[PDB]
Design a protein around this ligand. Structure first.
Ligand code: 0KN
Length: 367
């Protein structure tokens, strides 16, 4: 699958994008890869911050759907006109599909000044598609119309940034050791269940139900490891105590202040471990991240890449950059393995380990 290796680019905190073509003749766009939503959308108008945009008038294969669409993310909204057209991924599989495209005719806080992408590829499931689950997501169309296997994988490497999206398969050169799989709880977002959290090999002793309140998701469109309201406070209290040697302001832990060092004590910062529900009754595994994953370079004034949430645990780029991540849509599961590209020193290294015995793992799902 070497055709597809290193096909991702980006800037820190700004997301990862892949080159795509739309329409006939092919129009090239850079497209944010987003496992945390399900719409395919591209700029269709000359917004001052856009390098380029979808020109429907130039495409013989374009077809109107005569429907409006509105999509708001956490911050950032866009509005668009639904249609279909022919889509390719140049450094992806050698195929062309007819897919739904939201032509963005108006946005708000969506397109970033100075960014190099012109659209967004929602890779999650129809249930969370706008306007409703009858708008077939790009990946569903790709599988329906070709022989490409219902599976994709992401190696996000991490002010330039790189990675790989392997469509339709797995590339064993991108990970070391073994893949461990967690069930997709339900096909809307990529929902999984966290069953135990260890800061520095030490349990937070919280009810596991409150690691997944009100859900836990794997989301490549989110930069941060985002932890729910209760668990964040518990987590940070543990991270504070682990790092008592130095002090930092209250705003720093809330992502309200940068903390600066001269080109930095990695030790005195604890590894963070999430235990995930395994494939088997009472069997779990754990994934372990270094502080180089949760301390975001932005002197070296890093940012604290962990934040509280009203919407659940979000396993963002902070988590994903430690690992090769397999979205095995065929078997309703997500695989994790140690990435061949993750940022590590010589003292500590990112890990995926198992099996472990954890009882009552189902009780960790919120209802
Ligand atoms: C956490 O905020 C980040 C920046 C963000 O919103 N990322 C976007 C993808 C995105 C969106 C806008 C962007 C962008 C990337 O780069 C800059 O502009 C990602 O899709 C968010 N994924 C979940 C993440 C969550 C948090 C828990 C679910 O909130 C969301 N809310 C709304 C949506 C859209 C739909 C309701 C239509 C599905 C999705 C999500």
């Amino acid at each position: 699958f070497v055709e597809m290796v290193d096909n991702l680019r980006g800037k820190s905190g700004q997301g990862y994008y892949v080159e795509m073509t739309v329409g006939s003749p092919p129009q090239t766009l850079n497209i944010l890869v987003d496992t945390g939503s399900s719409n395919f959308a591209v700029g269709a108008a000359p917004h001052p911050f856009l390098h380029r945009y979808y020109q429907r008038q130039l495409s013989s294969t374009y077809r109107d759907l005569r429907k409006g669409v509105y999509v708001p993310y956490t911050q950032g909204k866009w509005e668009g006109e639904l249609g279909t057209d022919l889509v390719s991924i140049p450094h992806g599989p050698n195929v062309t599909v007819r897919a739904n495209i939201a032509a963005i005719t108006e946005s708000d806080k969506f397109f970033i000044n100075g960014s190099n992408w012109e659209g967004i590829l929602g890779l999650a499931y129809a249930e969370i598609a706008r306007p409703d689950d009858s708008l077939e997501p790009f990946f569903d169309s790709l599988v329906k119309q070709t022989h490409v296997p219902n599976l994709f994988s992401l190696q996000l490497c991490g002010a330039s940034v790189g990675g790989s999206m392997i469509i339709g398969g797995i590339d064993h050169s991108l990970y070391t050791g073994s893949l461990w799989y967690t069930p997709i709880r339900r096909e809307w977002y990529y929902e999984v269940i966290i069953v135990r959290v260890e800061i520095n090999g030490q349990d937070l002793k919280m009810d596991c139900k409150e690691y997944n309140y009100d859900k836990s998701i794997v989301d490549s469109g989110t930069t941060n490891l985002r932890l729910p309201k209760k668990v964040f406070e518990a987590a940070v209290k543990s991270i504070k105590a682990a790092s008592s040697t130095e002090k930092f302001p209250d705003g720093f832990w809330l992502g309200e202040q940068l903390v600066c060092w001269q080109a930095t004590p990695w030790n005195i910062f604890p590894v963070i471990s999430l235990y995930l529900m395994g494939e088997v009754t009472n069997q779990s595994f754990r994934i372990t991240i270094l502080p180089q994953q949760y301390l975001r370079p932005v002197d070296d004034c890093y940012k604290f890449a962990i934040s509280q949430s009203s919407t659940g645990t979000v396993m963002g780029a902070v988590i994903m950059e430690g690992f090769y991540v397999v979205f095995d849509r065929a078997r309703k599961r997500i695989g994790f393995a140690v990435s061949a590209c993750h940022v590590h020193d010589e003292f500590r290294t990112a890990a995926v380990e198992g099996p472990f015995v954890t009882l009552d793992m189902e009780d960790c799902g919120y209802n």
